[PDB]
Scaffold this active site. Sequence first.
Site, short mmCIF file in Angstrom:
data_model
loop_
_atom_site.label_atom_id
_atom_site.label_comp_id
_atom_site.label_asym_id
_atom_site.label_seq_id
_atom_site.Cartn_x
_atom_site.Cartn_y
_atom_site.Cartn_z
N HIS A 45 6.84 -0.42 3.81
CA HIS A 45 8.25 -0.20 4.17
C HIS A 45 9.09 0.21 2.94
O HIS A 45 10.16 0.78 3.07
CB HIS A 45 8.83 -1.41 4.93
CG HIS A 45 9.25 -2.54 4.05
ND1 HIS A 45 8.46 -3.66 3.84
CD2 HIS A 45 10.38 -2.74 3.33
CE1 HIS A 45 9.08 -4.49 3.03
NE2 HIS A 45 10.25 -3.96 2.70
N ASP A 93 1.70 -3.68 6.63
CA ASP A 93 2.75 -3.33 5.67
C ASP A 93 2.18 -3.23 4.24
O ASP A 93 2.37 -4.12 3.43
CB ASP A 93 3.88 -4.35 5.69
CG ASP A 93 5.15 -3.85 5.02
OD1 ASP A 93 6.10 -4.65 4.93
OD2 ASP A 93 5.21 -2.67 4.58
N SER A 188 10.65 -6.97 -1.93
CA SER A 188 9.61 -6.36 -1.10
C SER A 188 8.58 -5.61 -1.91
O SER A 188 8.94 -4.93 -2.87
CB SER A 188 10.24 -5.37 -0.11
OG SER A 188 11.06 -6.05 0.81
N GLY A 189 7.31 -5.74 -1.54
CA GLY A 189 6.24 -4.98 -2.15
C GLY A 189 5.70 -5.71 -3.36
O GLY A 189 4.62 -5.39 -3.84
#
Length: 240
Positions: A45, A93, A188-189
């Site tokens: 994402h 994801d 995120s990530g």
Amino acid sequence: VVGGTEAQRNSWPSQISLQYRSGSSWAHTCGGTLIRQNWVMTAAHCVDRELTFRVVVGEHNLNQNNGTEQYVGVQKIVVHPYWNTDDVAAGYDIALLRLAQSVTLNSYVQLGVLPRAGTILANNSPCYITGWGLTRTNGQLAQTLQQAYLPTVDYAICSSSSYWGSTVKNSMVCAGGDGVRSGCQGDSGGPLHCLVNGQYAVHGVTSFVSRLGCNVTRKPTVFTRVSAYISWINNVIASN
Ligand code: NA
């Protein structure tokens, strides 16, 4: 990272900052883990947007020269083929970025160590999330890399009605949910590092938190379970 503490500058040398070009300058958008000298693992994402990206390794303070950073362009983006941008809860994801040049390893820049395939953490296992994400719900990004202690919450619990219910899948890891510490936007990530047999390994890629806010009781931060994707990662790297 909400409720975090500043990391020592050589604690987490596989952490990267993924940034995008914003006018004449660059801006941090999410985290990631260096897994080969020329490959980075992040969340799918994070690369949904059609932006120009660069990776920064050996970063500590986003707003000051640390004397240790290497900046490298992103040459290719491989997102998991099953990923669906409007259904983060379906999973998959994860994405791999091939870098334009190979980075040089040193005490600030090291490859992340991945778990063996299939490995699942017992309930309440000690883990740290790291990143430069918001330091409070609807807050602002951290300047310096932050770390927070987030014990794992096993699937049986995380998938119960008062936690995440059906939204959480076996291909995910949940950690935290005490209402004080958590992942937040900009994290995120990034990696979830868990101590197993004396060695930190990256067990999770930060994927989502509750729309009701980052640090909410019984909504632990949700990560893609890296050990579910070991063969996928190897296959991508072997064929690129
Ligand atoms: Na810096």
